């Protein structure tokens, strides 16, 4: 099928994994999990669940930054997340963030903007890199849109 | 503001899926300096920026994001997603080839709706429009 008798339609696809060194890349495993990877050895997981991992409602940030034992990129991403729109735990270098959806409307709006709901919580945690992208290909557009 | 990064741009086998070497003319890529509603130029700018950043040196992209891309294009695509209009997943593009001479057209986004790519007949009109533009160009010179 050639258009106008001289032109033919052709297609191409783009690979965003060569951008792994500079831009964070996001992808959705399934409808309940989302993964944003920084570099090639560390990322961040966004989980919609009906389980509780932290009971207290405290959230301290000054002590976490003062200890200066964490990953700069991960803190930057969680900060640009929770200012664009909450139990917290960062002892031992961990990153555990709990959102008590069941405030919720804006958090889910940002979640849908990145990942572009009968779930009680939303948990943000730290993981290592694994081949997780199944439903969507990795692309930096979610974080680029969330930045501005 | 407006994007400021500047660029026969040629795409290597590490930037594509199931392709070896696809690349375009200077006339086609010259449009990337004077168009505001095209993704392909934004992706080209991101590619170029990553290339220079790695061969010359994440805060760099934090302070350099607005000099490369157009955020309102992302916002428009998000709005068309909310209101159930075909939008861009930001991966697939289509273009015309003209095998007899080799001159091509600047790639345009392949729309997505209901979790699947649109059929070629669902936007075929645009294709003829592009063909028309090309013929006028080859009738201009």
């Amino acid at each position: 099928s050639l258009y106008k008798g001289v032109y033919e339609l052709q297609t191409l696809e783009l690979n965003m994994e060569t951008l792994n060194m500079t831009m964070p890349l996001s992808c959705t495993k399934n409808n309940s999990h989302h993964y944003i990877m920084v570099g090639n050895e560390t990322g961040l997981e966004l989980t919609l669940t009906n389980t509780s991992i932290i009971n207290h409602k405290f959230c301290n940030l000054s002590d976490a930054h003062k200890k200066n034992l964490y990953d700069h990129a991960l803190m930057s991403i969680i900060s640009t997340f929770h200012l664009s729109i909450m139990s917290c735990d960062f002892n031992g270098g961990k990153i555990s963030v709990q959102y008590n959806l069941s405030v919720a409307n804006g958090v889910l709006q940002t979640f849908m903007r990145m990942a572009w709901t009968s779930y009680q919580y939303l948990i943000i945690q730290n993981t290592t890199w694994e081949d997780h992208c199944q439903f969507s290909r990795p692309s930096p557009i979610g974080y680029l849109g969330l930045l501005s | 503001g407006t994007f400021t990064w500047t660029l026969g741009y040629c795409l290597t086998r590490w930037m594509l899926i199931e392709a070896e070497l696809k690349c375009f003319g200077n006339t086609a890529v010259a449009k990337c300096n004077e168009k505001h509603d095209e993704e392909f130029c934004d992706m080209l700018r991101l590619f170029d920026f990553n290339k220079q950043a790695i061969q010359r040196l994440i805060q760099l992209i934090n302070k350099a994001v607005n000099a490369l891309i157009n955020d309102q294009l992302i916002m428009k695509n998000h709005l068309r997603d909310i209101m159930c209009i075909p939008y861009c997943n930001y991966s697939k593009y289509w273009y015309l080839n003209h095998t007899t001479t080799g001159r091509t057209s600047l790639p345009k986004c392949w729309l997505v709706s209901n979790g699947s790519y649109l059929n070629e007949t669902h936007f075929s009109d645009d294709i003829e429009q592009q063909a028309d533009n090309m013929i006028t160009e080859m009738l201009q010179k």
Partner: antibody
Framework: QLQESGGGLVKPGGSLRLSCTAS????????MNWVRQAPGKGLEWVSS????????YYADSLKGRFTVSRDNAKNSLFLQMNSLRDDDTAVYYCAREIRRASTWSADLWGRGTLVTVSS | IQMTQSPSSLSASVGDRVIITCRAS??????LNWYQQKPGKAPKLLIYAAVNLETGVPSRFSGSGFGTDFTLAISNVQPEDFATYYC???????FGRGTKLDVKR
């Protein structure tokens, strides 16, 4: 380095276990796989396992007999075989896998251990 | 997907150019790794991504090809370059038959 152990002589139909310990890199972040070589023939891939043991891939013909796992705390990689057959004598290598150019490639191989099954 | 390797055992002396071919039924894009193994020793990479080169490997090894065809080329074979060569697809993680290289007489 990657040091492997557990090889030796085992009767047919028995249960066997091999171990591969690593020292010199981050054991937590790397996919690791097991490869096999028969005496006088080509190479053969036994299995592959990811970092947090979430994606485990197995040989098409070896499925149902081989069980792989790892201990990230002790930097160890264990393989268990049950209902061994006579043609399961071979040399076993534990290889470290790395992802680059959108592709898996093994960049470090161990010394390899010999397993013999006979009556 | 099954790979076919040619030839089974080719013969060439020092200084000559040698070519080995790994061919696939389907199109595996650019996903192929080339290994070399010495008798009684663990193998080592020569080629990754079917065209690139592993660090610490001499520059006389050239990998090329696309789609259903791939080729390894050695220009000037040194005495320490007689071993068994394997082509491994990096998605299904399957090896090839193997090609052996021997001296000429």
């Amino acid at each position: 380095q990657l040091q492997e152990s557990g090889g030796g002589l085992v009767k047919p139909g028995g249960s066997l276990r091999l171990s591969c310990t690593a020292s010199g890199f981050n054991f937590n972040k790397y996919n690791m796989n097991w490869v096999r070589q028969a005496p006088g023939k080509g190479l053969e891939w036994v299995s592959s396992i990811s970092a947090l043991s979430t994606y485990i891939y197995y040989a098409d013909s070896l499925k149902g007999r081989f069980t792989v796992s790892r201990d990230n705390a002790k930097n160890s990689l264990f393989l268990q075989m049950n209902s061994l057959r006579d043609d399961d004598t071979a040399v076993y290598y534990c290889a470290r896998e790395i992802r680059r150019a959108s592709t898996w490639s093994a960049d470090l191989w161990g010394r390899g251990t010999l397993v013999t099954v006979s009556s | 997907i099954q790979m076919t390797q040619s030839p089974s055992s080719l013969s060439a002396s020092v200084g000559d150019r040698v070519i080995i071919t790994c061919r696939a039924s389907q199109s595996i894009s650019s996903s192929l790794n080339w290994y070399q193994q010495k008798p009684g020793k663990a193998p080592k990479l020569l080629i990754y991504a079917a065209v690139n080169l592993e660090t610490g490997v001499p520059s006389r090894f050239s990998g090329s090809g696309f789609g259903t065809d791939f080729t390894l080329a050695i220009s000037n074979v040194q005495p320490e370059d007689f071993a068994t060569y394997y082509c491994q697809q990096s998605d299904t993680r399957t090896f090839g038959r193997g090609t052996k290289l021997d001296v000429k007489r």
